[PDB]
Each structure stands twice: as C-alpha cells, then as structure tokens.
Ligand SMILES: CN(C)[C@@H]1C(O)=C(C(N)=O)C(=O)[C@@]2(O)C(O)=C3C(=O)c4c(O)cccc4[C@@](C)(O)[C@H]3C[C@@H]12
C-alpha cells in the first residue's frame with residue numbers, strides 16, 4: 001500500500017487501537033501495511049520514532065483548542081484547552097501513554113510558545129503561566145491515564161467505586177478543573193499580599 | 196535464595212530499578228534470584244501479579260503519610276498526603292507507571308476508607324471528598340509520570356524548558372498543589388452560593 005508519512009501514521013494509529021501501546025511493534029505495522037520489515041525501516045526506523053510521530057499527530061488531528069479565541073479570558077482558555085487535550089488523549093487506546101513517552105516537537109513549538117505568551121499577556125509571570133499550564137496538563141494526563149489504565153469493599157469506598165464508575169470520569173475531571181483554575185486566579189489576583 | 200513474599204518483592208524492586216517497568220520480566224527475576232522459572236511460577240504467577248504486589252508494597256514501605264494526624268486540618272492532610280504519595284512514587288524507577296497499572300488492594304481498603312470518612316467529617320459530601328482526593332491523586336500521578344518519563348527553541352519555551360528543568364519538578368508540583376487545595380476550599384466554603 002502507500003508508505004508516505006500520512007499513510008504510515010494512519011495505519012499505526014489503527015494498529016494502536018488494535019494492540020495498545022505495549023503491543024504495538026514495527027513488525028505488526030509492516031504486516032498491516034503488506035510489506036516486509038526492511039521496507040518499513042526505510043520509512044520508520046523504530047518504535048520510538050513511530051510513537052514520537054503518533055504523539056504529535058494525535059494532537060494535530062484532534063486537539064482543536066490549542067489557541068485562544070479573540071478576546072477569550074485566560075480562565076476560559078485553560079478550560080477549553082484542558083477539555084480539548086483530554087478529548088484528544090482519549091480518542092486512541094493508550095493515548096495518554098503515547099503522549100507521555102514523546103518530546104514537545106518543533107512542529108508545535110510555536111503553539112506552546114503562543115500559549116505561554118498569552119498567559120503572560122494576562123498578568124502571569126512566565127513562571128506562573130508555565131506552572132498553571134503544567135498543572136493543567138499534569139492533572140489532565142493523570143486523569144486520563146487512570147481512566148485508560150482502568151482497563152467485599154468497605155462502604156464509602158464501595159460507594160466511592162460506584163460513584164467513580166458512574167460516567168467516564170468526566171464529572172471528577174471537570175470538577176477538579178474548576179478547582180485548579182480558581183486556585184490559579186486566587187494566586188494571580190493576590191499579587192504581593194499574603195494569601 | 197529465600198522465596199518468601201517479602202524476599203521476592205525485595206528482589207523485584209531491585210530489579211525494577213535496574214530494568215524499569217517495560218523491561219522487568221519474570222524470567223529476569225528468576226535469574227536474579229538464582230532459580231529456574233518453574234520454581235518462580237510457584238511463588239509468582241506472572242508479571243501482572245508481580246506488579247500488583249509491587250504497587251501495594253511500594254506504598255506500604257514508603258508512603259508514610261496516608262492517615263491524618265490528630266486534629267490536622269483537611270488542607271494540611273491533603274498537602275502532606277500528596278507530598279508523601281509523590282515521594283513514594285519517585286523512590287523506584289517507573290514507580291508511577293507501576294502504581295497506575297495496579298488495583299486498590301484489599302490490604303489498603305481501610306486506609307482509603309478512613310481518608311474518605313475524614314473528608315466527610317470535615318464538611319465534604321462523599322462526592323466532593325472523593326473528587327478532591329482523586330484530583331490530588333491524578334495531579335500528583337501526572338506530575339510524577341512526566342518527571343520519570345522525562346528519561347533551536349522559541350524564547351519563552353526556551354526559558355520555559357530551562358525553568359522546567361531547574362529542579363526535580365518539586366516547585367511546579369507544590370505550586371499546583373496549593374492552587375488545587377485553595378480551589379477545593381473556595382468550593383467547600385461556598386455551600387449553595389453562586390461562586
Ligand atoms: C495546556 N495544554 C494541554 C497545552 C496544549 O494544549 C498543547 C498543544 N500542542 O496544543 C501541548 O503541547 C500541551 O498539551 C503540552 O503537552 C505541553 C508540553 O508538553 C510542554 C512541555 O513538555 C514542555 C514545555 C512546554 C510545553 C507546552 C507549553 O507546549 C505544553 C502545552 C500543552
């Protein structure tokens with residue numbers, strides 16, 4: 001079949017949904033594509049390189065809210081961005097694991113950059129903007145990982161574990177997300193006051 | 196050598212630090228212990244079972260702040276608990292990954308339970324206590340995973356990536372942790388007011 005980048009990634013994503021991250025191999029990708037392994041090697045040098053590309057592509061394809069709208073607030077931006085990031089990570093099997101093992105690609109540099117400039121333009125120091133953005137990313141990645149890796153009791157925990165498996169985790173995610181955002185705002189507004 | 200539970204786990208933890216999670220195998224554990232594989236199988240049935248036990252043991256050994264002190268506030272408890280949980284997850288290679296893939300063990304049921312009762316005894320509904328505790332756990336797991344898996348630029352990002360690799364991640368972690376805790380308190384205090 002065709003072995004241009006876009007096609008190889010299409011097939012590897014399809015493969016990822018079939019096998020998950022641990023079970024994805026270049027050998028099975030060759031098989032899926034109808035080719036021999038040394039043919040694949042010309043195109044894709046190893047699993048690490050494949051996963052690096054999948055991490056970038058998964059965001060490029062599906063992470064629709066990386067940039068703020070004209071005039072949007074920083075609260076609203078972080079909210080929408082977190083929800084988009086969560087959604088994209090959920091779309092493929094082990095997507096958060098794929099995301100974690102990879103590097104902040106040159107092809108996205110300018111996206112991140114803009115997000116950091118945006119925070120700063122709304123009153124955060126670089127440091128605080130970064131921390132805000134990192135806390136959101138880590139909270140979101142954590143919540144998704146636990147959702148995806150989720151694949152006799154005491155009473156509270158019995159009702160916790162029922163409550164906990166009542167939807168996708170969307171409720172607990174969204175509730176935490178507001179908590180975090182309000183905590184950032186309380187910090188931003190305080191300036192040099194003891195808070 | 197000796198193949199009682201405690202010894203097998205000692206050796207598997209030592210092995211985990213040598214190989215990481217992907218590279219830990221029952222075969223290499225047998226090797227480390229000076230035994231044949233079928234001897235190991237009597238004791239440990241597969242990797243999944245090994246990892247399940249390591250996840251529990253890593254907390255039991257090293258997670259010193261699972262229960263609140265007499266009279267401690269819920270803010271203080273969550274803070275200390277998060278820091279303890281982070282510390283324990285960091286102690287072994289891929290510790291957060293080991294933690295994620297495992298299940299909330301019967302041997303800890305009563306620890307979690309108590310934490311959930313404690314939140315509730317301080318004014319949270321079960322739901323909110325749970326969410327608070329889950330957001331902390333997910334934020335912490337996310338931050339640790341990214342620390343552990345962390346193993347030409349634009350300016351801000353250049354200074355972000357320098358700032359970001361200035362310590363262990365302890366600063367960004369602790370700053371987010373306070374944000375989250377304050378966000379929980381703002382929610383708890385508001386009751387039925389629009390907030
Ligand atoms: C908050 N939200 C989840 C952000 C986002 O939506 C991204 C995007 N491409 O649209 C990320 O890459 C984003 O999701 C993301 O993963 C970001 C990063 O990983 C990093 C790392 O590791 C180091 C320095 C800077 C960044 C970053 C500023 O680009 C991060 C931006 C993250």
Ligand SMILES: CN(C)[C@@H]1C(O)=C(C(N)=O)C(=O)[C@@]2(O)C(O)=C3C(=O)c4c(O)cccc4[C@@](C)(O)[C@H]3C[C@@H]12
Pocket residue numbers: 157160161164254258260261262276277280299303306307308310311328331332
């Ligand atoms: C907040 N802090 C990190 C808590 C903790 O310190 C624990 C401990 N053993 O001391 C956990 O097990 C704790 O770290 C932890 O992982 C908890 C859990 O995973 C769960 C899951 O998955 C489902 C229901 C309930 C729990 C829980 C209440 O036991 C969680 C308690 C977590």
Ligand SMILES: [Cl-]
Pocket residue numbers: 001002003004
């Ligand atoms: Cl071709």
Ligand SMILES: [Cl-]
Pocket residue numbers: 004005006007
């Ligand atoms: Cl292409």
Ligand SMILES: [Cl-]
Pocket residue numbers: 024025026027046047
């Ligand atoms: Cl491979």
Ligand SMILES: [Cl-]
Pocket residue numbers: 071072073076
């Ligand atoms: Cl807005």
Ligand SMILES: [Cl-]
Pocket residue numbers: 196197198199
């Ligand atoms: Cl023995």
Ligand SMILES: [Cl-]
Pocket residue numbers: 199200201202
């Ligand atoms: Cl023993």
Ligand SMILES: [Cl-]
Pocket residue numbers: 219220221222241242
């Ligand atoms: Cl194995």
Ligand SMILES: [Cl-]
Pocket residue numbers: 266267268271
């Ligand atoms: Cl206190």
Ligand SMILES: [Mg+2]
Pocket residue numbers: 099137
């Ligand atoms: Mg990232």
Ligand SMILES: [Mg+2]
Pocket residue numbers: 294332
């Ligand atoms: Mg857990």
